[PDB]
């Protein structure tokens, strides 16, 4: 067989095995041929599950018809995205905070997002992320090549800075014992855990980040469950503007997960060592990596930061809120412990003394529920079960019956 | 002021000026401020103008009601793309080359997938491009850190081979004077030239590659718009499995610059000098930086691939085509040396011993019409200007009005 001459990129090469998603994936697909006839529940990927909202969809339609009149016909948008979506996102998210339009970036996507800042920020910086965290903020620095080999002993990757966060520490990182790095990828709520920062914990985020000259990238993705009185975005905090950025997605809140519509801010102040402006560089990236989200994506997030889309948002929320309610309760009521669920649509279920994807193979085989192992969201991690509530209210029913089924016998 | 200590990305500083097509836009916004009711026409980017046809967004129109129904509801798909519109996709163009439906990445757009596969290709490999060419392929090779500084004596990043494409060369470069690279980007028919390959210059690009060990990225962005009988697709060329992948658009063919689909091609074939097939590492990078083109984007592609939506395509084209040869026809008339125009919706105008920039400066001054500057395209470059052939027929009878007023005299 012929072969090129060229090297694959060593960073593919640290890389341990495919994106937790597709692995799951072909476990699921290898448990349907060992039970053709198994009516499987996904409480896997937090994947949404019911119709956005007409007053959303109404919107883009109604755009796509446009594109076929001379009078509605528009070709490439700006690339940071429509003017008036800039000005409802700076307003609707960020009023009062000191965001301006053009601080905005619309996207196709946060996970798109988290990339694209990867390429701008570069091979040479180092990060640290939350241990446990969205298995993309890690993925994407080796690819980059931010970071050494995988350590099998410890399951990290080398020059990563895992902040390990744990009941034990009421899920927020001891600062104290954090060491330096140029990037902190902070997530609130924290996406397996379930955990939202405080006040008082954001500010105590910004001080390190100030003081160790660092940029935090704050993913929010899913601050519209918040229930607690805790901050939404990371520029409620004062001092942010100097050293975050923040990214954000309609997936969660809008049913968008295939429509691809997200954005990040970057304040003004936000500065590298040499005084250059981090958003000049991002707008670069934009420019020249992107051409923007789809205009009738864009559409419809212009129909979402209405009255009537806003409204629609919070009754599909608290949907999925009280899915998360149902799924509490279950595994409150088999004497588990349970965490998140308060502030974000999953829980963050202790399965102690055994290893997250074994427990995974368990409840998959027994139940044909597929839920994610803490252990694919890093080190951190192990023995936690993240349990999505994105489903159909019968779906999730039924779930939580099988557990109780599974799990009857062992409390107490 | 307060700044952090974290160092700005040295690739991000190699980086001349802003990206192209921003830096005209904005002398066009410059131009608006000191002239607010100049009746300005745009034939800089080629950004299409005609309404996508009612076969198309009547689809996408249909898959967004079906979001709002229990039953019609998808919510993430495969980043890979839907199976049928990979299938379309496979069959449509390359029906007959050997390519399966699994060998086809859909994205929300070619100039993401030159990024996503710089990405994948890393910071150690070198690239070749046609001079002039296309500026992303350059600048993400800059923002890889595949580059040295750009050198202001030749207007050229180091490290990188600018292979010569000339109106005396019939826009092919010698090959027998390009030296060798990791990977090489050929655009036919080339943006801004307007020259695509014949069958002989292609398969002597296959030939080149394979001694040379090399990927050749094929952009065929505007294969549609082919007048020539002339290969649509490398793959068309036997071997090319070995050396090649291809990435194209449905921009320019149905409109879609605002709505955001285009794919990539890669081989079975095509492996890592250590065998790893390269599809593999592509697969990876799309899992990993990107959640797929939009559900109603691709059921607008979909809705392309079909009798009726093919018609509407090769309208489209057809109309677009008939911009260009007024265009041509125009600066012919002139006494200009007009190039491309017979495979591409854009003509690049020769104006001798003078800067791009300036000729740029002028026409958009004096007839409010913008160009794009052939040195946006790289030093080869200089002073050729590229003209869009889209937009309405009033505004390209306008246009070619007001240059004809302009230049005759
Ligand atoms: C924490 C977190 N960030 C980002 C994403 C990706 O968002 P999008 O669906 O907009 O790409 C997900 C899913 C997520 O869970
Ligand atoms: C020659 C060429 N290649 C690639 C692209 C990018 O394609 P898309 O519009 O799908 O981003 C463009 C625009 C282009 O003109």
């Given at each position: 067989?012929?072969?090129?001459?060229?090297?694959?990129?060593?960073?593919?090469?640290?890389?341990?095995?495919?994106?937790?998603?597709?692995?799951?994936?072909?476990?699921?697909?290898?448990?349907?041929?060992?039970?053709?006839?198994?009516?499987?529940?996904?409480?896997?990927?937090?994947?949404?599950?019911?119709?956005?909202?007409?007053?959303?969809?109404?919107?883009?339609?109604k755009?796509?018809?446009?594109?076929?009149?001379?009078?509605?016909?528009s070709?490439?948008?700006?690339?940071?995205?429509?003017?008036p979506?800039?000005?409802?996102?700076?307003?609707?998210?960020?009023?009062?905070?000191?965001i301006?339009?053009?601080?905005?970036?619309?996207?196709?996507g946060?996970?798109?997002?988290?990339?694209?800042?990867?390429?701008?920020?570069?091979?040479?910086?180092?990060?640290?992320?939350?241990?446990?965290?969205?298995?993309?903020?890690?993925?994407?620095?080796?690819?980059?090549?931010?970071?050494?080999?995988?350590?099998?002993?410890?399951?990290?990757?080398?020059?990563?800075?895992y902040?390990?966060?744990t009941?034990?520490?009421?899920?927020?990182?001891?600062?104290?014992?954090?060491?330096?790095t140029?990037?902190?990828?902070?997530?609130?709520?924290?996406?397996?855990?379930?955990?939202?920062?405080?006040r008082?914990?954001?500010?105590?985020?910004?001080?390190?980040?100030?003081?160790?000259?660092?940029?935090?990238?704050?993913?929010?993705?899913?601050?519209?469950?918040?229930?607690?009185?805790?901050?939404?975005?990371?520029?409620?905090?004062?001092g942010?503007?100097?050293?975050?950025?923040?990214?954000?997605?309609?997936?969660?809140?809008?049913?968008?997960?295939?429509?691809?519509?997200?954005?990040?801010?970057?304040?003004?102040?936000?500065?590298?060592?040499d005084?250059?402006?981090?958003?000049?560089?991002?707008?670069?990236?934009?420019?020249?990596?992107?051409?923007?989200?789809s205009?009738?994506?864009?559409?419809?997030?212009?129909?979402?930061?209405?009255?009537?889309?806003?409204?629609?948002?919070?009754?599909?929320?608290?949907?999925?809120?009280?899915?998360?309610?149902?799924?509490?309760?279950?595994?409150?009521?088999?004497?588990?412990?349970?965490?998140?669920?308060?502030?974000?649509?999953?829980?963050?279920?202790?399965?102690?003394?055994?290893?997250?994807?074994?427990?995974?193979?368990?409840?998959?085989?027994?139940?044909?529920?597929?839920?994610?192992?803490?252990?694919?969201?890093?080190?951190?991690?192990?023995?936690?079960?993240?349990?999505?509530?994105?489903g159909?209210?019968?779906?999730?029913?039924?779930?939580?019956?099988?557990?109780?089924?599974?799990?009857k016998?062992?409390?107490?």
């Amino acid at each position: 067989e012929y072969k090129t001459k060229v090297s694959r990129n060593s960073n593919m090469s640290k890389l341990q095995a495919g994106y937790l998603f597709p692995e799951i994936a072909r476990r699921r697909s290898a448990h349907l041929l060992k039970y053709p006839d198994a009516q499987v529940i996904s409480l896997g990927i937090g994947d949404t599950t019911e119709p956005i909202p007409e007053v959303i969809t109404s919107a883009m339609a109604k755009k796509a018809h446009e594109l076929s009149t001379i009078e509605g016909y528009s070709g490439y948008g700006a690339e940071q995205g429509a003017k008036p979506l800039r000005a409802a996102i700076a307003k609707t998210f960020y009023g009062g905070l000191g965001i301006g339009d053009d601080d905005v970036f619309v996207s196709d996507g946060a996970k798109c997002d988290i990339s694209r800042l990867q390429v701008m920020f570069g091979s040479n910086v180092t990060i640290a992320v939350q241990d446990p965290s969205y298995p993309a903020y890690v993925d994407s620095s080796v690819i980059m090549g931010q970071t050494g080999q995988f350590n099998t002993d410890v399951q990290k990757y080398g020059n990563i800075e895992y902040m390990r966060c744990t009941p034990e520490n009421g899920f927020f990182p001891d600062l104290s014992t954090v060491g330096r790095t140029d990037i902190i990828f902070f997530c609130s709520p924290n996406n397996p855990t379930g955990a939202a920062a405080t006040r008082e914990q954001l500010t105590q985020l910004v001080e390190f980040a100030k003081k160790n000259g660092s940029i935090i990238v704050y993913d929010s993705a899913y601050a519209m469950y918040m229930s607690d009185d805790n901050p939404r975005s990371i520029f409620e905090i004062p001092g942010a503007e100097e050293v975050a950025m923040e990214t954000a997605s309609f997936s969660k809140y809008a049913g968008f997960t295939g429509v691809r519509l997200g954005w990040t801010v970057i304040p003004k102040k936000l500065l590298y060592s040499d005084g250059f402006p981090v958003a000049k560089d991002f707008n670069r990236i934009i420019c020249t990596c992107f051409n923007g989200a789809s205009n009738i994506s864009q559409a419809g997030a212009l129909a979402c930061l209405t009255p009537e889309g806003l409204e629609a948002m919070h009754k599909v929320i608290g949907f999925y809120k009280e899915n998360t309610n149902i799924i509490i309760d279950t595994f409150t009521s088999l004497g588990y412990d349970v965490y998140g669920g308060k502030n974000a649509p999953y829980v963050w279920v202790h399965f102690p003394n055994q290893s997250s994807w074994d427990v995974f193979a368990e409840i998959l085989e027994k139940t044909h529920v597929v839920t994610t192992p803490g252990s694919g969201f890093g080190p951190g991690g192990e023995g936690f079960v993240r349990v999505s509530a994105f489903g159909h209210r019968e779906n999730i029913l039924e779930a939580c019956r099988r557990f109780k089924q599974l799990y009857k016998h062992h409390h107490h």
